[PDB]
Write an enzyme that holds these catalytic residues in place. Structure first.
Site, short mmCIF file in Angstrom:
data_model
loop_
_atom_site.label_atom_id
_atom_site.label_comp_id
_atom_site.label_asym_id
_atom_site.label_seq_id
_atom_site.Cartn_x
_atom_site.Cartn_y
_atom_site.Cartn_z
CG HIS A 69 -0.29 -0.23 2.50
ND1 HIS A 69 0.09 -1.49 2.92
CD2 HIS A 69 0.14 0.63 3.44
CE1 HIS A 69 0.77 -1.38 4.11
NE2 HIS A 69 0.79 -0.06 4.41
CG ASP A 76 -0.49 -10.44 6.96
OD1 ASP A 76 -1.22 -9.43 7.09
OD2 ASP A 76 -0.17 -11.17 7.92
CG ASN A 91 8.74 13.25 5.06
OD1 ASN A 91 9.89 13.29 5.51
ND2 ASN A 91 8.35 14.03 4.05
N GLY A 93 5.70 10.37 9.38
CA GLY A 93 5.82 10.22 10.82
C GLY A 93 4.45 10.43 11.46
CG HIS A 97 -0.37 2.90 6.99
ND1 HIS A 97 0.76 2.71 6.23
CD2 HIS A 97 -0.62 4.23 6.95
CE1 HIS A 97 1.19 3.91 5.72
NE2 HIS A 97 0.33 4.86 6.17
CG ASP A 100 -10.02 -2.01 3.87
OD1 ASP A 100 -10.63 -1.69 4.90
OD2 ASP A 100 -10.53 -1.94 2.73
CG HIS A 119 -0.92 -1.28 19.97
ND1 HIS A 119 -0.23 -1.82 21.03
CD2 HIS A 119 -0.11 -1.41 18.89
CE1 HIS A 119 0.99 -2.26 20.58
NE2 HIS A 119 1.04 -2.00 19.25
CD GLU A 120 -0.91 0.12 15.13
OE1 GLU A 120 0.08 0.63 14.58
OE2 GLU A 120 -0.91 -1.03 15.63
CG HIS A 123 3.43 1.99 17.79
ND1 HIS A 123 4.44 1.59 18.63
CD2 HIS A 123 2.73 0.88 17.47
CE1 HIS A 123 4.34 0.23 18.78
NE2 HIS A 123 3.28 -0.24 18.06
CG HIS A 129 5.72 -3.25 20.43
ND1 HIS A 129 6.11 -3.91 19.29
CD2 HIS A 129 4.52 -2.67 20.15
CE1 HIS A 129 5.14 -3.68 18.34
NE2 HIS A 129 4.14 -2.91 18.87
O1 CBP Z 1 3.12 -4.25 16.56
C1 CBP Z 1 2.60 -4.04 15.51
C2 CBP Z 1 2.29 -5.12 14.47
C3 CBP Z 1 2.00 -6.63 14.86
S1 CBP Z 1 0.13 -6.65 14.87
O2 CBP Z 1 -0.26 -6.12 13.56
O3 CBP Z 1 -0.15 -8.08 15.07
C4 CBP Z 1 -0.77 -5.82 16.15
C5 CBP Z 1 -1.13 -4.43 16.07
C6 CBP Z 1 -1.84 -3.79 17.13
C7 CBP Z 1 -2.20 -4.54 18.32
O4 CBP Z 1 -2.88 -3.94 19.39
C8 CBP Z 1 -3.18 -4.30 20.74
C9 CBP Z 1 -2.12 -4.60 21.68
C10 CBP Z 1 -2.44 -4.96 23.02
C11 CBP Z 1 -3.81 -5.01 23.43
CL1 CBP Z 1 -4.17 -5.42 25.00
C12 CBP Z 1 -4.88 -4.72 22.50
C13 CBP Z 1 -4.57 -4.36 21.15
C14 CBP Z 1 -1.85 -5.96 18.42
C15 CBP Z 1 -1.14 -6.57 17.35
C16 CBP Z 1 2.60 -7.66 13.83
C17 CBP Z 1 4.18 -7.64 13.86
O5 CBP Z 1 4.70 -7.93 15.20
C18 CBP Z 1 4.12 -7.17 16.31
C19 CBP Z 1 2.56 -7.10 16.27
N1 CBP Z 1 2.45 -2.69 15.21
O6 CBP Z 1 1.56 -1.96 16.03
CA CA Z 2 4.02 13.56 11.03
CA CA Z 3 -3.58 -8.99 7.91
ZN ZN Z 4 1.65 0.97 5.89
ZN ZN Z 5 2.51 -2.13 17.89
#
Ligand code: CBP
Ligand code: CA
Ligand code: CA
Ligand code: ZN
Ligand code: ZN
Length: 160
Positions: A69, A76, A91, A93, A97, A100, A119-120, A123, A129
Site C-alpha cells: 500500500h 498480509d 513526512n 511520521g 495504517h 483493510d 495501540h497504534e 506508536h 512496544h
Molecule cells: O506491533 C505491531 C504489528 C503486529 S500486529 O499487527 O499483530 C498488532 C497491532 C496492534 C495490536 O494492538 C493491541 C495490543 C495490546 C492489546 Cl491489550 C490490544 C490491542 C496488536 C497486534 C505484527 C508484527 O509484530 C508485532 C505485532 N504494530 O503496532
Molecule cells: Ca508527522
Molecule cells: Ca492482515
Molecule cells: Zn503501511
Molecule cells: Zn505495535
C-alpha cells in the site's frame, strides 16, 4: 515501557489527525467514534490536544490499505499483521495504517478497531512496544477501558 531511539516525540501539544478513508465493514460513524475514543485515551493523560481535519495534510494521517500500500510494511490479508504506525517526525511520521483485509468491528467478534487504534496511536506518539504483558503497548492483541499504568508512565515520561 519503551521509547524509540533518540526519544522521538512531537514538539507541539496541538496535533491534527485525518481519517483518509474507511473500512467497508463498518459505517463511517462507528469508524469515527472508534478513533475519537482512541485519541481520548491519550489526551486524557497528557497535555496533548487532537483536532480532526478533513482537507490537507495532518500530523497524523489515518488510512486503511491492503497488501502492498505504498510503504515498506506490506499487509498480509486476513489475520496476521493488523496494523502499523510510524513514530513522531516529518513526512509519514505519526501516520497509522490499518489492514483493510481484516474484519473490523466495534464489538469483540472480530478485531476491535478502537483497541488496535489506541495501540497504534501510542506508536504515533512516541511509544515503542512494552515488555509488560498487561500494557496496551504489549505486542499481542487481546480485547476484553482504562489505560494500564505502564502506558501512562511511558506517555507522561514523554509529554509530562
Ligand atoms: O506491533 C505491531 C504489528 C503486529 S500486529 O499487527 O499483530 C498488532 C497491532 C496492534 C495490536 O494492538 C493491541 C495490543 C495490546 C492489546 Cl491489550 C490490544 C490491542 C496488536 C497486534 C505484527 C508484527 O509484530 C508485532 C505485532 N504494530 O503496532
Ligand atoms: Ca508527522
Ligand atoms: Ca492482515
Ligand atoms: Zn503501511
Ligand atoms: Zn505495535
Amino acid at each position: 515501557y519503551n521509547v524509540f531511539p533518540r526519544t522521538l516525540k512531537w514538539s507541539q501539544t496541538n496535533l491534527t489527525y485525518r481519517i483518509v478513508n474507511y473500512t467497508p465493514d463498518m459505517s463511517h460513524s462507528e469508524v469515527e467514534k472508534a478513533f475519537r475514543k482512541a485519541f481520548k485515551v491519550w489526551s486524557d493523560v497528557t497535555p496533548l490536544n487532537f483536532t480532526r481535519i478533513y482537507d490537507g495534510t495532518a500530523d497524523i494521517m489515518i488510512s486503511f490499505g491492503t497488501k502492498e500500500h505504498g510503504d515498506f510494511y506490506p499487509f498480509d490479508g486476513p489475520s496476521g499483521l493488523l496494523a502499523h504506525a510510524f513514530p513522531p517526525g516529518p513526512n509519514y511520521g505519526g501516520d497509522a495504517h490499518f489492514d483493510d483485509d481484516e474484519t473490523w468491528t466495534s464489538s469483540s467478534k472480530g478485531y476491535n478497531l478502537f483497541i488496535v487504534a489506541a495501540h497504534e496511536l501510542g506508536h504515533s506518539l512516541g511509544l515503542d512496544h512494552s515488555k509488560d504483558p498487561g500494557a496496551l503497548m504489549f505486542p499481542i492483541y487481546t480485547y476484553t477501558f482504562m489505560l494500564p499504568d505502564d502506558d501512562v508512565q511511558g506517555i507522561q515520561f514523554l509529554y509530562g
